[PDB]
Structures are given as structure tokens and as C-alpha cells.
Amino acid sequence: GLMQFTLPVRLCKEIELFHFDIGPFENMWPGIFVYMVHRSCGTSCFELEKLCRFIMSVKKNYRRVPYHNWKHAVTVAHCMYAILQNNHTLFTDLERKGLLIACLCHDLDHRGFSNSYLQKFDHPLAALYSTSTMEQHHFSQTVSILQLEGHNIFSTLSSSEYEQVLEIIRKAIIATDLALYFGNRKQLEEMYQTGSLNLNNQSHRDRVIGLMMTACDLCSVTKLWPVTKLTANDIYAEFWAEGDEMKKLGIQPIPMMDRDKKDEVPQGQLGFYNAVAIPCYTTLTQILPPTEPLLKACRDNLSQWEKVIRGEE
Numbered sequence: 619g620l621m622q623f624t625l626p627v628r629l630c631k632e633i634e635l636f637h638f639d640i641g642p643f644e645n646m647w648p649g650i651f652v653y654m655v656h657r658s659c660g661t662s663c664f665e666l667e668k669l670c671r672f673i674m675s676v677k678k679n680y681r682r683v684p685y686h687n688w689k690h691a692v693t694v695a696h697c698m699y700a701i702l703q704n705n706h707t708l709f710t711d712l713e714r715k716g717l718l719i720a721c722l723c724h725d726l727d728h729r730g731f732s733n734s735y736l737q738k739f740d741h742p743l744a745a746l747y748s749t750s751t752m753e754q755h756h757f758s759q760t761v762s763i764l765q766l767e768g769h770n771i772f773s774t775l776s777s778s779e780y781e782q783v784l785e786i787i788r789k790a791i792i793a794t795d796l797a798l799y800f801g802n803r804k805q806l807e808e809m810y811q812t813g814s815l816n817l818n819n820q821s822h823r824d825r826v827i828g829l830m831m832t833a834c835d836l837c838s839v840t841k842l843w844p845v846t847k848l849t850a851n852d853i854y855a856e857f858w859a860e861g862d863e864m865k866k867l868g869i870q871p872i873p874m875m876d877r878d879k880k881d882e883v884p885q886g887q888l889g890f891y892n893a894v895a896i897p898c899y900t901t902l903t904q905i906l907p908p909t910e911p912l913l914k915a916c917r918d919n920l921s922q923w924e925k926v927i928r929g930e931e
């Protein structure tokens with residue numbers, strides 16, 4: 619285990635920043651993830667042969683969809699890495715191990731369709747899992763890959779630590795269901811403001827990890843404008859495909875998913891930053907002050923979308 623991963627100078631420096639873009643070279647993404655695990659967790663956290671086999675099976679189980687693909691998995695993992703590196707002492711050994719794996723696995727086998735579309739289509743997964751449909755599926759796929767021979771990266775954990783890490787991963791992946799975020803953020807807002815937020819309270823830790831998962835999952839809105847703007851195209855490529863599939867079931871989709879209403883995109887992003895993103899990063903900055911650069915970048919991107927609307931770009 620004297621084999622370190624190193625990145626070229628520009629990446630070695632920029633990877634520490636919240637707004638890092640992992641770049642268009644797919645073959646560098648595994649090495650970027652291993653680099654992050656080594657610095658975030660330690661060079662001993664995982665057996666490298668097992669980790670590499672885990673990563674390549676996870677990659678194979680992401681689909682070639684415009685947005686919810688392998689690049690998203692690694693991008694979301696990198697956002698978690700930056701949060702963990704700016705909040706060193708706040709998180710246990712198992713949490714750091716668990717959360718980067720949770721982020722890598724959080725959208726496993728995504729087909730580019732919302733929980734709503736599965737329900738309206740009457741997909742088998744909607745019968746198996748009544749709520750957080752895709753998210754229970756992502757966690758199921760995680761456990762499946764973990765159970766493949768030579769893929770159990772948690773092998774050296776005790777039985778109790780193993781149940782703990784798999785519970786961190788399960789709660790973290792379920793928390794990426796945006797329908798759960800609204801209630802979770804509201805509850806964290808109340809607890810921070812009334813002064814009852816207690817990081818020794820496991821149910822409180824769970825909620826804070828939940829908000830971090832939402833924060834990492836939405837992190838396209840916290841990049842530099844050229845990345846945010848170009849990621850928005852991939853996000854909308856999926857929304858519009860889903861809108862088309864709604865129209866095939868004889869259902870008018872919400873306007874955000876209707877490709878006849880592309881003109882309304884900039885105003886839809888405004889609503890989304892105001893309703894979801896800004897509140898998310900505001901509450902996260904309150905609980906974890908060193909994540910402030912995410913809120914700042916989100917506010918900058920909101921300002922850029924206001925400029926699109928005024929015809930200034």
C-alpha cells in the first residue's frame with residue numbers, strides 16, 4: 619500500500635475547491651475518486667484491488683443517459699469530498715468511508731426518469747417501492763455490487779461497523795429523494811434557530827448528512843457559470859425525454875419537462891434556485907460554515923440566470 623495516486627498539478631490544486639469540474643476524460647475519473655478516498659479517508663481505508671473492482675462494477679451499472687450517468691456519480695462524490703475536507707473533525711471514520719461510496723452509488727442504474735414517471739407508467743419498481751422508488755433501487759444495486767465476489771470493500775470492518783456503514787449509505791441514498799429534502803431542511807432550520815441542533819444526537823447527524831447529500835446532488839448549480847450552463851442542457855435533455863414519455867401516456871407534463879416550452883427554461887431555473895437550491899445551501903452554510911463557497915457560487919449562478927432573462931446573455 620505504498621502506491622499513492624497523484625493528479626497533475628492543476629487538478630491536485632483545483633480538486634480541493636468546491637467548484638472543481640472533473641473534466642471530459644472518463645478514464646481519469648476512477649483515479650480522481652481513489653485520490654479523494656485516500657486523502658479523505660486514508661490510504662488503508664480500503665484494499666486497492668477491491669476498491670478498483672468496486673468502482674469498475676459501479677461504473678458499468680450507470681447507464682448512458684444525458685445527466686444521471688457515471689460523470690454525475692463522480693461529480694456528486696467530489697462535492698462530498700470538498701465538504702468532508704473543509705469539516706475535517708466533524709465526521710467519524712465510518713462516515714467518511716460511507717459517504718463517498720454513498721455518493722458514487724447514489725444514482726446506480728438510473729434510467730433518466732423521475733419517481734413520478736415510474737408511478738404513472740406503473741413500472742414494477744413502483745410496486746416494489748411505494749416511496750423514494752429509484753432511491754430504494756439505487757441502494758439495492760449498491761448492496762448487490764458489494765455482494766459480488768472480491769467486491770466487498772468493507773471486509774476488514776467488524777460486524778457492527780459493517781451494519782453501521784451500510785445504514786449510513788442507505789440513509790444517505792434515500793436522502794437524495796428531493797421530495798424528502800423540503801421537510802428535512804425545514805426541520806434542520808427549526809433545530810439550528812431554536813438552538814436544539816445537537817451533533818451527538820444520531821437522528822440529528824442523519825438529517826445533516828441528508829442535507830449534505832441534497833447539497834452534493836444539486837452541486838451543478840454551484841459550479842462556475844460555463845459549467846452550470848452546459849450541465850443545465852444535460853439536465854433538460856432528460857426532463858424533455860420524460861415530458862415526451864408523459865405525452866405518450868396521455869399526460870401533459872409540468873412545463874419544466876415540456877420541450878415545447880424551452881423559452882420558459884431561464885424562469886424555471888430562477889424558481890428552482892429560489893425554491894430549492896438557495897434554501898438548501900443557506901441552511902447547510904448555517905450548520906456547516908466552511909461550505910459557504912457553495913452558497914456564494916449558487917447566488918452567482920442565480921444572478922447569471924437573471925441576466926439570461928433580461929437578454930444580457
Ligand SMILES: Nc1ncc(OCC2CCCC2)cn1
Nearest residue numbers: 732838839850853874887890
Ligand atoms: N439545475 C437544476 N437541477 C435540478 C433540477 O431539478 C428539478 C426538479 C423539479 C422536477 C424535476 C426535478 C432543476 N434544475
Ligand SMILES: [Mg+2]
Nearest residue numbers: 724725752794
Ligand atoms: Mg437520484
Ligand SMILES: [Zn+2]
Nearest residue numbers: 724725794835
Ligand atoms: Zn443524483
